[PDB]
Write a protein that binds this ligand. Sequence first.
Ligand SMILES: CCOc1cc2ncnc(Nc3cccc(-c4csc(CO)n4)c3)c2cc1OCC
Ligand SMILES: CCOc1cc2ncnc(Nc3cccc(-c4csc(CO)n4)c3)c2cc1OCC
Ligand SMILES: CCOc1cc2ncnc(Nc3cccc(-c4csc(CO)n4)c3)c2cc1OCC
Ligand SMILES: CCOc1cc2ncnc(Nc3cccc(-c4csc(CO)n4)c3)c2cc1OCC
Ligand SMILES: Nc1ncnc2c1ncn2[C@@H]1O[C@H](COP(=O)(O)O)[C@@H](O)[C@H]1O
Ligand SMILES: Nc1ncnc2c1ncn2[C@@H]1O[C@H](COP(=O)(O)O)[C@@H](O)[C@H]1O
Ligand SMILES: Nc1ncnc2c1ncn2[C@@H]1O[C@H](COP(=O)(O)O)[C@@H](O)[C@H]1O
Ligand SMILES: Nc1ncnc2c1ncn2[C@@H]1O[C@H](COP(=O)(O)O)[C@@H](O)[C@H]1O
Ligand SMILES: O=P(O)(O)OC[C@H]1O[C@](O)(CO)[C@@H](O)[C@@H]1O
Ligand SMILES: O=P(O)(O)OC[C@H]1O[C@](O)(CO)[C@@H](O)[C@@H]1O
Ligand SMILES: O=P(O)(O)OC[C@H]1O[C@](O)(CO)[C@@H](O)[C@@H]1O
Ligand SMILES: O=P(O)(O)OC[C@H]1O[C@](O)(CO)[C@@H](O)[C@@H]1O
Ligand SMILES: [Mn+2]
Ligand SMILES: [Mn+2]
Ligand SMILES: [Mn+2]
Ligand SMILES: [Mn+2]
Lengths: 319, 319, 319, 319
Amino acid sequence: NIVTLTRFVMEQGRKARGTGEMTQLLNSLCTAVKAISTAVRKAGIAHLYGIAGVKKLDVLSNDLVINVLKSSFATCVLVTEEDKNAIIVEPEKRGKYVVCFDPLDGSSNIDCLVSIGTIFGIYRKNSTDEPSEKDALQPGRNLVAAGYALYGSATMLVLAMVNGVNCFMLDPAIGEFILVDRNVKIKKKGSIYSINEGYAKEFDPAITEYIQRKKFPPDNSAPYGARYVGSMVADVHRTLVYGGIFMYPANKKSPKGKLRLLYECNPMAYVMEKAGGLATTGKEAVLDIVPTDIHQRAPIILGSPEDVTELLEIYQKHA
Amino acid sequence: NIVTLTRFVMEQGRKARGTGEMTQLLNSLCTAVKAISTAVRKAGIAHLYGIAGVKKLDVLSNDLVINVLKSSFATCVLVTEEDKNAIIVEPEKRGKYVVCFDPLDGSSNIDCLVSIGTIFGIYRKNSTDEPSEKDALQPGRNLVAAGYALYGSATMLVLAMVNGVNCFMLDPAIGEFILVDRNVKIKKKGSIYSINEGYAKEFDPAITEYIQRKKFPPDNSAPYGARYVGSMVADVHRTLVYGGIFMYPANKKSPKGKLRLLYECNPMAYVMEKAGGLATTGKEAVLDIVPTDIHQRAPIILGSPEDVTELLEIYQKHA
Amino acid sequence: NIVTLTRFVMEQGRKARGTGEMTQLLNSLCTAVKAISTAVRKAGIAHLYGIAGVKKLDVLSNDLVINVLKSSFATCVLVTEEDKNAIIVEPEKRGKYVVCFDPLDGSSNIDCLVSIGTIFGIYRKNSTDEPSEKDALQPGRNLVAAGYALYGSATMLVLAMVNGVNCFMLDPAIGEFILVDRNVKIKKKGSIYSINEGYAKEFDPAITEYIQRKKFPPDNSAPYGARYVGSMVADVHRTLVYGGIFMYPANKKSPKGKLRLLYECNPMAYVMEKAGGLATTGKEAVLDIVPTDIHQRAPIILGSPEDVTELLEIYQKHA
Amino acid sequence: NIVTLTRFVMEQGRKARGTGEMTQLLNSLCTAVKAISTAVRKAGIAHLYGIAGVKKLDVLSNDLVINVLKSSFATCVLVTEEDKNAIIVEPEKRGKYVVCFDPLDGSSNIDCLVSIGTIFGIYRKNSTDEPSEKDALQPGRNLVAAGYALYGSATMLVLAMVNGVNCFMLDPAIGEFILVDRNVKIKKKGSIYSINEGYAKEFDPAITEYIQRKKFPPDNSAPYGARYVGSMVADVHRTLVYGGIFMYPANKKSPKGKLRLLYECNPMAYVMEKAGGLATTGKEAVLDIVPTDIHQRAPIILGSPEDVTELLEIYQKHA
Ligand SMILES: CCOc1cc2ncnc(Nc3cccc(-c4csc(CO)n4)c3)c2cc1OCC
Ligand SMILES: CCOc1cc2ncnc(Nc3cccc(-c4csc(CO)n4)c3)c2cc1OCC
Ligand SMILES: CCOc1cc2ncnc(Nc3cccc(-c4csc(CO)n4)c3)c2cc1OCC
Ligand SMILES: CCOc1cc2ncnc(Nc3cccc(-c4csc(CO)n4)c3)c2cc1OCC
Ligand SMILES: Nc1ncnc2c1ncn2[C@@H]1O[C@H](COP(=O)(O)O)[C@@H](O)[C@H]1O
Ligand SMILES: Nc1ncnc2c1ncn2[C@@H]1O[C@H](COP(=O)(O)O)[C@@H](O)[C@H]1O
Ligand SMILES: Nc1ncnc2c1ncn2[C@@H]1O[C@H](COP(=O)(O)O)[C@@H](O)[C@H]1O
Ligand SMILES: Nc1ncnc2c1ncn2[C@@H]1O[C@H](COP(=O)(O)O)[C@@H](O)[C@H]1O
Ligand SMILES: O=P(O)(O)OC[C@H]1O[C@](O)(CO)[C@@H](O)[C@@H]1O
Ligand SMILES: O=P(O)(O)OC[C@H]1O[C@](O)(CO)[C@@H](O)[C@@H]1O
Ligand SMILES: O=P(O)(O)OC[C@H]1O[C@](O)(CO)[C@@H](O)[C@@H]1O
Ligand SMILES: O=P(O)(O)OC[C@H]1O[C@](O)(CO)[C@@H](O)[C@@H]1O
Ligand SMILES: [Mn+2]
Ligand SMILES: [Mn+2]
Ligand SMILES: [Mn+2]
Ligand SMILES: [Mn+2]
């Protein structure tokens, strides 16, 4: 098209007078995403089933991300959903960026072929001391870039930076992401709510009340439709493009929520705020949480500002 | 691999002593599904965005299916979700099969990139008179073959015939569907329920009671998880592979349900029963309904037999 | 398109009242050619160079062909350029066909990326005794089908059978070979000659005289252009589509020529004669040679009939 | 792999302290090459043959190159084999580079599917006046970068810059060119000669003598093999990787040779000299010719230094 992601990032880098390190990191991430997307779509699966006479997909996707990021020479600390500790990049390959990611979000949808994706959040190292896990413990408000690749009906890379959110469709015939939605903004009010209602017995009173309103509107408006793919990248992408609200609040399993702060909640909250939406725990903005553990969890409610504000008012009412 | 769908259908045709007409119909459908899959995944999208200086996807998918089926020389009547009247195949291209299909199920999810699919049902012409719409008005029990292609994280073709259900993964590197799950059988009891709960105000008492039991099990077992992608092919495929129950019952917009009998409900009911599951409207088996309109709708409840039976027992209790 | 190779072979099998065994053999060969093509074009090469942290191409191609042919259940004896002995198919996988092939012709051009291909010849088993090498020792005149797949700028499968030659272009986006040139016939006279002139010191007097006439036409016409890719499949395909003559005559390293009779010369001679061309050793028709060794060589001159006849007349003049 | 072309060029740009303009130009060219390669391999050809119910390849390839180069914002003048005049880029899209290219070299091999390719040469604008055709008239010695993409058995991008030549294989599964041959150097002496011998009656005495030596070596060494694909990119690539010599000297058609100086001869001479080889007209170095017309032709002899020197000595002998 007129605009490839490669051209977009290179132009954004030149406008920012970057040294080329962040541009290289973003180019490396795009490469990883294409390698993951091809594996996810099962190109070459015949070679595993004996056509000429292994690693799980999530593990392979982690290896792709890690390898491609270390070889960018732009990173110093990596936090992955798959690794118990932060990965400290070798001194020879060290750059200034800290990346938190989930290489293959929705991995429990993997076997039923439901949409899955990769989520990432990028920070600039904060201190001058040896890179360590604490470099990945900055609040989401410090993000320099975040987004996700969705391996859905087609593969799309959504990238959010200071000035906004842009969506790029992967054209797998030529391995280019094409800019198709510019400076995306979410609708102020949607008509879809997204939550796993199987935890109904464990929900707090405010979530319980809010769902009841979506089904039985007190002003007699049309009830909201319900959608829950069960893969955060897919439900979040729908929320972004169509509007509405996505909820993964606390319950019994965890009064801290299920989703991970560093590489699930923070990245999606950043994309949402850059698109004009909101992302809250129900009590505080996700992006201002000060993380204390790289695998910390957090409740998250995100989406159209009027819908998220309505839920916030209910929590306030109950407080 | 060892088994391509081309080899599988050819061997099944030889074992049945077919003349080759149904084999050719099935080979043509496979070809159409690969062309659809490539368009769905947006291979070549850069050519629509000016890389070198239109039809919607559902329309394109329909043209692919119709053209490829007509050119098989195996059909006489086609019913498509997209066309108001049954298509009567020209005399020169006429064979004995009647095909009912939705070329791109889940079209409302197209723009948010969630999984979408193609659903098909194949019948043998019943009468000796000129082919007409009435040849597509057979109960699903008369199906000779049905299934779907899901364009999800990967593309899979699920084919059900008299002796059972088989799953073939499309390897897009060579354009072959590889047999990956043989003689599939659904779990007797699942732990996921799938329904759009935004219609809660319009549900009948039996659905209402059932959903409440999934959330607050009277036996104190763990509540079922909820999933609702909102694309029938995706929810039904997850139901088949992981077990559980999928529901699209009657509501206010339709006391006859929303999903179409000939090319949504019948094909999915046939796959389910061949896999050892159940498919009911809540009062009668979907496959035994004798349709009177090619675009008739029907309520549908399908999935693991213990789950569907529990819901049928509630209906019976209320009656 | 209107005609896929899958549809073409299935229709040809139905018209011949075949049992489906040769149709299945041809479908399996198509599958093998797509797997080879994808490997030749290096799809997935990044996985050999550490993107996420072996067999030569000719060997891989051979394994693909052998595995796919054995699993067709249509063959009993395979002769490959790569194996010293004929392969005798296990009794359980045995059918009636004998296949001679070069899985990756032009292997010397592999490293410089010039066009390479797969050549095949198919015979019906002749006798009632245990299949053995002798079943592959039939003159090319007994071929039931032959052709090649060229991995050139695009991949094309050329198939010759009793009634003629057809060309099918592989569309790698959907893995279908599309009929693009029907009932192909070679030009009666070309204007290109193809031979390795580095053996000029070893050529017989008739080849020497002929080449001199192409360069200095005694009738003062324009000299023929010269082309010699050095991969038989590529030179022969150009000969078929544009006309002219291809020569690999006897030399010093071999007074019997270099090219192999069973899986290079016979298949190409059969395609040529079905397209209205000629294929001679300079003294007798290639197709009428009764081989005595599966790896026997033969001199070969093939192409437009007026050109080949002019060269045969020189041989006769000298005799 | 470890090294993609995108990473390679970005690192080379940062080492050179470029502003990012040349990096962007090279990234744009890679994008064009992938779009051309997919069209050349005929992905999507089924859509031209009626699968769901035009521009020639050379024209399409020209449109891709021009469009992608103008949108790089890095060029001011473009010279293409397909356009009679130089293209002056619009002031808004103007950068400092001058690009000469043949978008699809070997287009007479197109219909027989022989290897074809794209050749390019990049110059930095020389003067401060309005960009015009004269900006493309610098001797090849001023090139900042040159190379070619070969659409052969696999697609390879060969890029030559001040410090040497590197070869990158296109992995079409992910649209990345992977570095596979680093700092390539041609053999000092080869054993292959490449020339169209159909012009034997029109060759000068030195070429005539040289060919006779390759066939009948006066010191009784083994004669050289002969190869002539008839596509300059293919014959040149073979010469680079295997060694030997490639000749397209003057004759009757033109005592100035056939190949074009600006976008055939200069680029290939630059690649050859950067790889340790030679490229001469027989009388002067190609790279030092001062061009007087954008479509000027020039004789060219190129390849292994010992072989090219031997031919130069023969020309000198004859002078
Ligand atoms: C989830 C992990 O997925 C894979 C792991 C593999 N590990 C190891 N090897 C793999 N592939 C493989 C194995 C043997 C040969 C080839 C092969 C040979 S030629 C060729 C053409 O690209 N591919 C590929 C894998 C493929 C995977 O996914 C296919 C969709
Ligand atoms: C939703 C319908 O989608 C398409 C419709 C098209 N109609 C018309 N033309 C299309 N593509 C197009 C247009 C111009 C040139 C080419 C082209 C030239 S060379 C090439 C290589 O495959 N493709 C393709 C379409 C592509 C579509 O989807 C691509 C992802
Ligand atoms: C010349 C033989 O070529 C190959 C041999 C291979 N053997 C073994 N493995 C191969 N590939 C490979 C290895 C590890 C992982 C994967 C892989 C993982 S996910 C994926 C997606 O297709 N591919 C593939 C091979 C690839 C070849 O060619 C690729 C162009
Ligand atoms: C040599 C020119 O090549 C092409 C020109 C085209 N011009 C115009 N349109 C083209 N393609 C086309 C036309 C209609 C529909 C589509 C299409 C619809 S959906 C889809 C999936 O990518 N592609 C593509 C062309 C394709 C070409 O090459 C195919 C290998
Ligand atoms: N490609 C890019 N896109 C957006 N911002 C960038 C880019 N490159 C650099 N920047 C900005 O400039 C900073 C420093 O760049 P760098 O010198 O490459 O680390 C970044 O951390 C961003 O704030
Ligand atoms: N490929 C096939 N797979 C399964 N059943 C087949 C196949 N081909 C034919 N049959 C059975 O044989 C009947 C008639 O085949 P046909 O002569 O092709 O119409 C079918 O309608 C099926 O009952
Ligand atoms: N697909 C086909 N195309 C052309 N001829 C065929 C085909 N199938 C069968 N035949 C002819 O029928 C004979 C026997 O077929 P079969 O019973 O499959 O072995 C062949 O050996 C050919 O002569
Ligand atoms: N990617 C690159 N690779 C090699 N050299 C480069 C690159 N970018 C810039 N240069 C060198 O630096 C010069 C100026 O770059 P630029 O400012 O982008 O025009 C070039 O003309 C080359 O000499
Ligand atoms: O099954 P549950 O509890 O609804 O959890 C689903 C969530 O878990 C995850 O799979 C974990 O990341 C998310 O993608 C998704 O939103
Ligand atoms: O939006 P609703 O009413 O839940 O309907 C969704 C259903 O409609 C369809 O999109 C139309 O067939 C189905 O794929 C899906 O099951
Ligand atoms: O190098 P030579 O002797 O010209 O032989 C080339 C021939 O050898 C082969 O590579 C081997 O079969 C053929 O494809 C080709 O025609
Ligand atoms: O047919 P001839 O005169 O040998 O010309 C072939 C040459 O012409 C071209 O096709 C023109 O670029 C070159 O690729 C090739 O080297
Ligand atoms: Mn995960
Ligand atoms: Mn549908
Ligand atoms: Mn061969
Ligand atoms: Mn040209």
